Scaffold this active site. Structure first.
Site, mmCIF file in Angstrom:
data_model
loop_
_atom_site.group_PDB
_atom_site.id
_atom_site.type_symbol
_atom_site.label_atom_id
_atom_site.label_comp_id
_atom_site.label_asym_id
_atom_site.label_seq_id
_atom_site.Cartn_x
_atom_site.Cartn_y
_atom_site.Cartn_z
ATOM 1 N N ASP A 8 6.293 -9.872 4.786
ATOM 2 C CA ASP A 8 6.754 -9.768 3.419
ATOM 3 C C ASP A 8 7.210 -11.158 2.937
ATOM 4 O O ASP A 8 7.511 -12.021 3.756
ATOM 5 C CB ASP A 8 7.880 -8.735 3.351
ATOM 6 C CG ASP A 8 8.487 -8.497 1.994
ATOM 7 O OD1 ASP A 8 7.635 -8.255 1.066
ATOM 8 O OD2 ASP A 8 9.681 -8.696 1.826
ATOM 9 N N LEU A 9 7.258 -11.346 1.600
ATOM 10 C CA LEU A 9 7.721 -12.628 1.034
ATOM 11 C C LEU A 9 9.178 -12.521 0.554
ATOM 12 O O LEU A 9 10.052 -13.205 1.045
ATOM 13 C CB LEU A 9 6.790 -13.107 -0.081
ATOM 14 C CG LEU A 9 6.901 -14.602 -0.455
ATOM 15 C CD1 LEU A 9 5.721 -14.989 -1.328
ATOM 16 C CD2 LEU A 9 8.216 -14.950 -1.128
ATOM 17 N N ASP A 10 9.421 -11.722 -0.491
ATOM 18 C CA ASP A 10 10.697 -11.754 -1.187
ATOM 19 C C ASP A 10 11.799 -11.189 -0.284
ATOM 20 O O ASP A 10 11.691 -10.064 0.209
ATOM 21 C CB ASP A 10 10.587 -11.009 -2.524
ATOM 22 C CG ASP A 10 9.402 -11.473 -3.364
ATOM 23 O OD1 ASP A 10 9.327 -12.667 -3.640
ATOM 24 O OD2 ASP A 10 8.547 -10.630 -3.722
ATOM 25 N N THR A 16 13.986 -14.745 -3.066
ATOM 26 C CA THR A 16 13.467 -14.300 -4.345
ATOM 27 C C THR A 16 13.728 -12.808 -4.585
ATOM 28 O O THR A 16 13.563 -12.362 -5.726
ATOM 29 C CB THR A 16 11.974 -14.618 -4.485
ATOM 30 O OG1 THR A 16 11.373 -14.319 -3.225
ATOM 31 C CG2 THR A 16 11.742 -16.063 -4.855
ATOM 32 N N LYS A 45 13.392 -2.744 -4.048
ATOM 33 C CA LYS A 45 12.824 -3.773 -3.182
ATOM 34 C C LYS A 45 11.505 -3.270 -2.598
ATOM 35 O O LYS A 45 11.407 -2.122 -2.177
ATOM 36 C CB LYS A 45 13.800 -4.181 -2.082
ATOM 37 C CG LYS A 45 15.054 -4.892 -2.535
ATOM 38 C CD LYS A 45 15.910 -5.342 -1.348
ATOM 39 C CE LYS A 45 17.130 -6.083 -1.845
ATOM 40 N NZ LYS A 45 18.107 -6.351 -0.766
ATOM 41 N N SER A 114 2.490 -9.179 1.004
ATOM 42 C CA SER A 114 3.369 -9.091 -0.161
ATOM 43 C C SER A 114 2.725 -8.305 -1.297
ATOM 44 O O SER A 114 1.567 -8.415 -1.603
ATOM 45 C CB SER A 114 3.772 -10.450 -0.648
ATOM 46 O OG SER A 114 4.674 -10.397 -1.768
ATOM 47 N N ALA A 115 3.566 -7.486 -1.921
ATOM 48 C CA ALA A 115 3.232 -6.810 -3.182
ATOM 49 C C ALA A 115 3.196 -7.770 -4.375
ATOM 50 O O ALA A 115 2.720 -7.393 -5.451
ATOM 51 C CB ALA A 115 4.246 -5.717 -3.441
ATOM 52 N N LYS A 145 3.556 -0.278 -1.622
ATOM 53 C CA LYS A 145 4.654 0.138 -0.662
ATOM 54 C C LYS A 145 5.465 1.254 -1.318
ATOM 55 O O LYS A 145 5.792 1.152 -2.491
ATOM 56 C CB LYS A 145 5.572 -1.026 -0.270
ATOM 57 C CG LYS A 145 4.887 -2.224 0.356
ATOM 58 C CD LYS A 145 5.768 -3.439 0.504
ATOM 59 C CE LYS A 145 4.949 -4.635 0.951
ATOM 60 N NZ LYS A 145 5.755 -5.870 1.168
ATOM 61 N N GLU A 169 10.194 -7.382 7.214
ATOM 62 C CA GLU A 169 10.531 -6.790 5.921
ATOM 63 C C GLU A 169 12.038 -6.792 5.694
ATOM 64 O O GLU A 169 12.814 -6.681 6.645
ATOM 65 C CB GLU A 169 10.012 -5.351 5.809
ATOM 66 C CG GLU A 169 8.692 -5.244 5.081
ATOM 67 C CD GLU A 169 8.803 -5.352 3.549
ATOM 68 O OE1 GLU A 169 9.987 -5.389 3.047
ATOM 69 O OE2 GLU A 169 7.729 -5.364 2.856
ATOM 70 N N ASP A 170 12.436 -6.821 4.407
ATOM 71 C CA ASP A 170 13.817 -6.667 3.989
ATOM 72 C C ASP A 170 14.055 -5.397 3.173
ATOM 73 O O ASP A 170 15.174 -5.225 2.687
ATOM 74 C CB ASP A 170 14.296 -7.844 3.132
ATOM 75 C CG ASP A 170 13.603 -7.911 1.786
ATOM 76 O OD1 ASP A 170 12.353 -7.696 1.769
ATOM 77 O OD2 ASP A 170 14.291 -8.114 0.742
HETATM 78 O O1 LIG Z 1 6.082 -8.636 -10.026
HETATM 79 P P1 LIG Z 1 5.488 -9.184 -8.740
HETATM 80 O O2 LIG Z 1 5.676 -10.658 -8.556
HETATM 81 O O3 LIG Z 1 4.065 -8.725 -8.581
HETATM 82 O O4 LIG Z 1 6.316 -8.581 -7.503
HETATM 83 C C1 LIG Z 1 6.093 -7.235 -7.065
HETATM 84 C C2 LIG Z 1 7.158 -6.868 -6.014
HETATM 85 O O5 LIG Z 1 7.032 -7.802 -4.932
HETATM 86 C C3 LIG Z 1 7.865 -7.414 -3.824
HETATM 87 O O6 LIG Z 1 7.672 -8.398 -2.849
HETATM 88 C C4 LIG Z 1 9.331 -7.395 -4.278
HETATM 89 O O7 LIG Z 1 10.142 -6.917 -3.179
HETATM 90 C C5 LIG Z 1 9.551 -6.494 -5.460
HETATM 91 O O8 LIG Z 1 10.919 -6.626 -5.879
HETATM 92 C C6 LIG Z 1 8.583 -6.855 -6.568
HETATM 93 O O9 LIG Z 1 8.711 -5.946 -7.666
HETATM 94 F F1 ALF Z 2 7.323 -9.917 -0.897
HETATM 95 AL AL1 ALF Z 2 7.673 -8.190 -0.866
HETATM 96 F F2 ALF Z 2 8.013 -6.464 -0.918
HETATM 97 F F3 ALF Z 2 9.473 -8.490 -0.940
HETATM 98 F F4 ALF Z 2 5.984 -7.773 -0.858
HETATM 99 MG MG LIG Z 3 10.967 -8.131 0.340
#
Ligand SMILES: O=P(O)(O)OC[C@H]1O[C@@H](O)[C@H](O)[C@@H](O)[C@@H]1O
Ligand code: ALF
Ligand SMILES: [Mg+2]
EC number: 5.4.2.6
Length: 219
Positions: A8-10, A16, A45, A114-115, A145, A169-170
């Site tokens: 995962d990223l955020d 972030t 999240k 990452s999403a 997710k 993951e967080d």
């Molecule tokens: O709006 P983005 O940048 O596509 O991010 C989608 C999701 O990405 C996930 O990594 C985050 O945990 C979520 O908080 C976020 O909504």
């Molecule tokens: F980077 Al994420 F859920 F936090 F895909």
């Molecule tokens: Mg995350």
């Protein structure tokens, strides 16, 4: 031994998750929904942009037009994208850069699961792109997710089975996604948020190759 790590990223690579929270809270309040606090945000999240907005609307049993939904999602993204412009390598969480180097040196594949559609931009801001063997495209998966699809895609993109992978993951939704993929989850955060049934570390400095090996051997 595991053959890939699926990141995962955020909230894993960098702080972030805090900025997504602040941006969603600001949007919610502009539309008169005040329930997006840190506790509620645990349900946001890991969730896609559109699913996040829908969960917020649902909190207040609020309905908006399709046109308004699109505009609100765009407004939140535009704000979030402004917030992250000054992200730099200095913002990489403790331990993460060293883990990437150590994985790479032990021929363990590295994939982004990452999403976030802002994922590629963030890895470039942090000078991390060259460590990643693959980035799963979140626009391509049929389900987000806590569906496992993004983790399965990440593993397949580096030629590894999910069952030969660790996922980091967080989020509650992301931990569930990892579990359902067949990969081994290691969460970062509070057990009160992420559960007592998987390994959870209190902060990313605990994500060492030594520790990942420590966990794989035992589970
Ligand atoms: O709006 P983005 O940048 O596509 O991010 C989608 C999701 O990405 C996930 O990594 C985050 O945990 C979520 O908080 C976020 O909504
Ligand atoms: F980077 Al994420 F859920 F936090 F895909
Ligand atoms: Mg995350």
């Amino acid at each position: 031994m595991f053959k890939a790590v699926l990141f995962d990223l955020d909230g894993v690579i960098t702080d972030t998750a805090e900025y997504h929270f602040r941006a969603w809270k600001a949007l919610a309040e502009e539309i008169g929904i005040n329930g997006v606090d840190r506790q509620f945000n645990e349900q946001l999240k890991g969730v896609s942009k559109e699913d996040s907005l829908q969960k917020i609307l649902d909190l207040a049993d609020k309905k908006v037009s399709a046109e308004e939904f699109k505009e609100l999602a765009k407004r939140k993204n535009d704000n979030y994208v402004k917030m992250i412009q000054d992200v730099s390598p200095a913002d990489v969480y403790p331990g993460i850069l060293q883990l990437l180097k150590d994985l790479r040196s032990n021929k363990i594949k590295i994939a982004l699961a990452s999403a976030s559609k802002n994922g590629p931009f963030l890895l470039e801001r942090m000078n991390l792109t060259g460590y990643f063997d693959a980035i799963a495209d979140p626009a391509e998966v049929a389900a987000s997710k806590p569906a496992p699809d993004i983790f399965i895609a990440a593993a397949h993109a580096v030629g590894v089975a999910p069952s030969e992978s660790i996922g980091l993951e967080d989020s509650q939704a992301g931990i569930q996604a990892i579990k359902d993929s067949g990969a081994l989850p290691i969460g970062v955060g509070r057990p009160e948020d992420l559960g007592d049934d998987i390994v959870i570390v209190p902060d990313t400095s605990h994500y060492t190759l030594e520790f990942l090996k420590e966990v794989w051997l035992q589970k």
